[PDB]
Amino acid sequence: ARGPKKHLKRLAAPHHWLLDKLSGCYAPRPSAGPHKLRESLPLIVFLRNRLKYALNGREVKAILMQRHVKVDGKVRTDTTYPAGFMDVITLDATNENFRLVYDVKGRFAVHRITDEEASYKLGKVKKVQLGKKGVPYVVTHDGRTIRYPDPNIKVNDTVKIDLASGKITDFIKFDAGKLVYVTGGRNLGRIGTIVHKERHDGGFDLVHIKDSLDNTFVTRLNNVFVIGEQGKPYISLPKGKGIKLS
Amino acid sequence: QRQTTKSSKRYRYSSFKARIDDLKIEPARNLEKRVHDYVESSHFLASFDQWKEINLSAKFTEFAAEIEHDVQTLPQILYHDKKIFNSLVSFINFHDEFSLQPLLDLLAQFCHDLGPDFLKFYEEAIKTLINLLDAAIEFESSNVFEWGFNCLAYIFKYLSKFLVKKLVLTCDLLIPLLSHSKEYLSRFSAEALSFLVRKCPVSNLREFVRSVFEKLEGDDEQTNLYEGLLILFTESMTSTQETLHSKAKAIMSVLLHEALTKSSPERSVSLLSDIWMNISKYASIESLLPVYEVMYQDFNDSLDATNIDRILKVLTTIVFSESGRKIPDWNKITILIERIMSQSEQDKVAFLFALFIRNSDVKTLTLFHQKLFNYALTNISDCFLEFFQFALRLSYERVFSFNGLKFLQLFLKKNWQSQGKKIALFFLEVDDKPELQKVREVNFPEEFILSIRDFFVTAEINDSNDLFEIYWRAIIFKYSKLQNTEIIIPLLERIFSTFASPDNFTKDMVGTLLKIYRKNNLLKTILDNYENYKESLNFLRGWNKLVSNLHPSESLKGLMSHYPSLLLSLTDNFMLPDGKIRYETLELMKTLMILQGMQVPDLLSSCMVIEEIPLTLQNARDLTIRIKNVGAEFGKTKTDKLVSSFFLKYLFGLLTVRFSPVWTGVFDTLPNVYTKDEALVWKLVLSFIKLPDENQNLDYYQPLLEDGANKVLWDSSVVRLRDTIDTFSHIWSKYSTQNTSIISTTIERRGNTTYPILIRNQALKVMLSIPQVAENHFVDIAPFVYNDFSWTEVDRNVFLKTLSKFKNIKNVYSATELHDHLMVLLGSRNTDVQKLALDALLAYKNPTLNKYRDNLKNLLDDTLFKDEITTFLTENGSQSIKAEDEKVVMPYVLRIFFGRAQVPPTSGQKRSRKIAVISVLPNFKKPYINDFLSLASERLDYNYFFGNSHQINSSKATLKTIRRMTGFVNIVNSTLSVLRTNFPLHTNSVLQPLIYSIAMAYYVLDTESTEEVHLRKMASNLRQQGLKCLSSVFEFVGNTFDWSTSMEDIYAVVVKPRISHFSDENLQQPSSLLRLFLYWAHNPSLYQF
Amino acid sequence: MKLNISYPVNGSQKTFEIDDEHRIRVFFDKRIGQEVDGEAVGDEFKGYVFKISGGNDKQGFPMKQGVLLPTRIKLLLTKNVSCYRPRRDGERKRKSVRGAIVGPDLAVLALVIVKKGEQELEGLTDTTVPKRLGPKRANNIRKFFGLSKEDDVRDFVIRREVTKGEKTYTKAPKIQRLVTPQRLQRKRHQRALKVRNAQAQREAAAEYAQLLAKRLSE
RNA sequence: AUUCAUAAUAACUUUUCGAAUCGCAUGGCCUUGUGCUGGCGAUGGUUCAUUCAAAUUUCUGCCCUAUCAACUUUCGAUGGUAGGAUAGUGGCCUACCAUGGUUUCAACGGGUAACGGGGAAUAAGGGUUCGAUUCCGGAGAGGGAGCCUGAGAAACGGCUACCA
RNA sequence: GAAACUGCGAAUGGCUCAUUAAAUCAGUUAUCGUUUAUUUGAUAGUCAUGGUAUAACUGUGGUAAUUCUAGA
């Protein structure tokens, strides 16, 4: 191609999206936004294929013009808005909230969420830097750019952010024996507490994690996402608690 | 304009106010398969299960949890009535819109189920409901407005009978929201209580309406409540689609009687009148006729009381409302007019008479007009002239087919002495409108005419009040129909003797006397005194009336040959801004040339045609073609001095005429016959240059103050009736203040001759197009240069362009003073002025400037600036300026560098430009750099202090002088920093303005209060920078030159503000004054301080 | 050939067919921008002065200035030139075009009237057409009527009286570049918003400085 | 891991930006000026980050051919220094320098009705043979040569020349 | 709301595998050697508001002809 493409095949979609082969040749190519391409979800696939409330693009389009849903308080009117993991979805006329969070089945997962939990949101600080005029700041995993954070925080760090001000509620460091979500990889969604971290200078650092059934596995730090302390999640968790069984 | 033509898309933006304007209430004008109206278990339960299906809001779900635990049947309603209602109002004041729609719906059906016993709840329900409406006003939901007022109409339909028994209390519960200052809130509450009004029975109607009348007089201040009751009764009669009904005419009966009560407010009478107007506008006459019958009935009932004014008011509205298209019988109305007139046995009488003369049918007017005019002649005698004026502006042709002039003559015969100032006020006004030839034909009372003539006989004139009375009796004395010429004569020469310098009033009044002439020696005397009485249109009109009355005989030819200067004085009259007076001068001069001889030319006739052309964009090309045609004819044809002066002053009138295609035409025309006559036009253009900055006072005679004005009619709300009463009241105000209105309308008929400010710029464009004659004299424009105007910058620029376009530029009148001002404006900051100054300076031909022409040109240019600086301002390089050429062109370089330093450093670009200026400064030479410093000190001054010792001559602490000061001390700091060790100081060019500036900073600190925050801030900055450059120059030069002369003065400016508290002020960080003191205490020669 | 003669002052224009060759020999060897004597053309244009404005050849190929050759030529035309309207952005196609030097091959020579001589021309000098559009900008209409700076223009708005059957009506353009109190409110919000942001940034900076100072004191 | 982030200095610029925009409504003031303040959203805008990208770049892997053993280096083949060019690294190119580099572990060049892969067939396995062909990657749009616009084209339902 | 100016797209889609044998492709890199229109998130105190135009349109034309145009 002599540039980017506007087109997305049916089979070209990520497998976790659970979209059939037969009701289309095309998947809706998601627009650019916070998250990256394969670990997102368009809102129309969210609504029609999970919430089932609309069945057509004209329907969901009319809804977006009806200005209902606010993602983190902000409405989008984009159909293919790239909604990713750990997201707050606010439903006014139905009076609900939804945390978008990975499935034990490796898929995504809606979560029925109250207003107090929707008031804030979580974020993996991925890069702390020093900006122009010597201003210190961070960029999270969801692309939130926050000036002037607490100096004790470093990269990859879990931060509770109030959405209502878009401000740093509090933070959680990266220690062993912290409750961690795994975002990507084969074992994603399997919530566990970190055993430790095999570190490599310049290399992909591996992480050993043990979960409640005393089961240990190893993923990469990119998949690693700390939630909270032991028995202390800052969020409400869905059924199964991220536990793989037979 | 609203959206009338619907576009094709399914989704309009539909703003909130538009939603409000489209919203209505009544569900009976709506309908549907209502679920509560559809299933009949219980209405409240049906609505509750329906909204339990529909709504998903947390407020309503908690509510529904509680209530679906509480009530499941109508006995459960009747048992737990209070608790469910308290939970209802709890969530109602919990204020959730998503729950507010269904909760309002359950409120409505809860009342529908609980009817007769609900009222105890219903009252504080009204309270909380109107609180919720105010909450929606804080919010912005047309949906919430619709839901609330729909619920309101629901409760009204459910609980009608108890509320129509207790109606006036329900009005009181909503009055603060009816009188609430929101038109649409008032409108919606008016629709709901209007439904209730159309429901209510007659006894409660009369009671409630009378109490509304008293409530109106209580809140006489409020108009929103007034209009609310307007639209209330309006909708109560309007309710259907096009036809008011029998309940509407019953309401009309009730309101009509209750307002025809003598104690009823006349404000409520106007309210009724506007209600009637709106109903008449809405409904059709087939629906309207029984209401007309009930109206005539109640008129014949209550026709005899003290409220004849009130019935006259409502009848005036009835006659005016639309037309005979809703009026059944002008004959019935005529009968009621006879009844009201017999019962009366003023202002509103005049208005009703005029509206009947307009609005009625001619088949009724052919019989009632005699009775109408006898009624008017008898009753409204002084108001007859006001009425006749309003009727002539309303429908003149009606009375002209009828006998307006006859009854006018009868009125004049019956009375002419009482309101003779109003008589002229009528007869002055009729002159302008040319549809009044019958009026300018009509006759006058003979006693009145002879009394005016005898007052003219016995007239003393030596007062401007006497001028007022004589001019008044003249403007009555127009239609004298007698030989009045020899009676005009002695008063005319009396004025011409007694007044050498006439007032504009004097000219106008004697010109009215020239108009009074109908059918020799008067022409002789006006040819004597026209030189005084030239410029006034009323004079010119009466004079042309004389001349057109006259016939060209040979004795008059002899006298006109004896009188020489008439046509040149008329050319001077052609030089005037007013096209009307210039065309009047035109036709006068034509007729005079016919009387004199037969030399009447095509130029005069054509330019008459040109003044006769109106001004449109469609006639613009035509007019410019015409101007080019007449200019070509004037240039081709041979010219007398008379006709040349004519053509020139006429073209300059067309310069004044204020039209761009005409300006193009005259700019095409004039550069070919300025050769024909370049002498007179030199005075014409120069007069325009001196035009407006000289005063233009048009001081007229002012009469004494008379306070005649009345609210002669009620205040309306329908805007057409508002316009009519405004017109009638304006004419009444004039007729009451007849004195000054005669004065003002005379000025309104006098005409303007004040020149535009742009005429100076037009003369500047003429001076651009014609440089040689400006290059010829130059003696009168030299004062403008040497006074420096304040003119506009574009004026100065086009003048500088004329200066560049000058050819013999060195042999102008004061060449060196021109060069001085040229150098000043070259040093000026405005780069366009610098360009034009260099253009005039290069018009000044000297071989060194011809050498470095393009050099200083690219120096003036911006994007080659620093490169040119590094190129040929660099010492010991290519294109470096030679010795004697440098000596002779040096001041120009310092002027352009003064400007390029005078640019403000708004950005890094301008900052770097100024930096490069000051950084290439160190290389030139000592006296040249000192001359740049001399110019920098020359933009300032020190001779105040140094003609004194240290005393201020005038306390000028002004922003302009201190901004020049701070620019000076800033370039002083910069020059210090870039020439620390090498620069020459001069006590006259460097030292004295600096101590002048620090002392000025101290004086603007001390002498004024601390309220001038910007002046005191700039004072602090000036002291800062002045002491900064003080210590800078002290460390920079040390002992390189002497210090003993200015020693005591700089020590004085040290010891005045600082040494008292220098220890208290300078302790945080070492001040520049501290560094100065330490350089003093270190350098041994500076130990004297 | 056909001399399309145009008087721009009247905005008038006509054509004049020419059969003889002697005025054409007067015309020969010239090009666009150059001037000519109407008397040297003929009798009726006595004293008249024109200037070459254009032409089209006997195949229709127009003359174009810049090229000094009395023939046609294939020039790689670009956007901002005459004789060319690109249907796409940046479109540059090569086209054949008659040149600027006057040849006999012109079906049409088009001349503008520079200076009038003595005799009135029927189609051009006798009558005119007034302009189609008055200006739309507020300062434009100010310059046009000589409107003062204190003077408003909405009273001076040029209105066309149109008529549709019996409903006579008028037309008036939107006054572009017009200062409004709404513009003042817009400017006011701009200033207030900038100042508000400055205060908020300063406050957040001061608070974060307080925070880090306390943390360092720990 | 860094001459990094970031901060300071001294200048520089055919000197960039720091809203002359727009729609809905219209409030609060008060010196009663048609003076002052005020909402909603719409566009644009500097820098950074994101996202979508693209461009380079490493390891490992190709069918046959020795009756194919030497090969590349004027004309860049191998390496160096400097410049240019680029969006950048880089012989990519230019200069001035050194003589390199690969190969029987098959270099090179030749054949390939050779688009690569996931996949398809077959046997019990080992294997064998296909795969233009629903996805991905790259290439092209009669073929040589070249270009404009645009963030993105050497575009071809764009443009210039050749040949047909 | 025609037209026209302005904005953006028109560098994807669809068709074919001519060519191409470490070339692509695949896996595995990495760009601390690159730019990024767009999304998103942050991000700027340092005249009651100039001018030039030109389309569209009016009007005169060319030719055998084109989604050709010229003059005004």
Structural description of this entry:
Chain B: Belongs to the UTP20 family. Chain B: It comes from Saccharomyces cerevisiae (strain ATCC 204508 / S288c) (Baker's yeast). Chain B: It is found in: Cytoplasm; Nucleus, Nucleolus. Chain B: This is U3 small nucleolar RNA-associated protein 20. Chain B: Interacts with snoRNA U3. Interacts with MPP10. Component of the ribosomal small subunit (SSU) processome composed of at least 40 protein subunits and snoRNA U3. The structure is cut from a larger assembly and holds chains A (246 residues), B (1089 residues) and C (218 residues). By secondary structure, chain A is mainly beta. Helix content of chain A is 9%, strand content 33%. Chain A has 3 domains: 1-116, RNA-binding S4 domain (Structural Genomics Hypothetical 15.5 Kd Protein In mrcA-pckA Intergenic Region, Chain A); 121-171, OB fold (Dihydrolipoamide Acetyltransferase, E2P); 174-244, SH3 type barrels, CATH 2.30.30.30. Chain A has 3 helices and 17 strands. In chain B, 69% of the residues lie in helices and 0% in strands. In chain B, helix 14 (246-260) packs antiparallel against helix 15 (266-282) and helix 52 (926-938) packs parallel to helix 54. Chain B has 58 helices and no strands. Chain B is mainly α and 1089 residues long. Chain C is of the alpha+beta class and 218 residues long. Chain C contains 5 helices and 9 strands. In chain C, strands 2-1-7-4-3 form a 5-stranded mixed beta sheet. Chain C has a two-stranded antiparallel ribbon with strand order 5-6. Chain C starts with a strand and ends with a helix. The interface between A and B is small, with 5 and 6 residues. Chain C binds 2 RNA strands through strand 1, strand 2, strand 4, strand 7 and helix 5.
Compact summary:
Chain B: It comes from Saccharomyces cerevisiae (strain ATCC 204508 / S288c) (Baker's yeast). This is part of a larger assembly, with chains A (246 residues), B (1089 residues) and C (218 residues). With 246 residues, chain A is mainly beta.
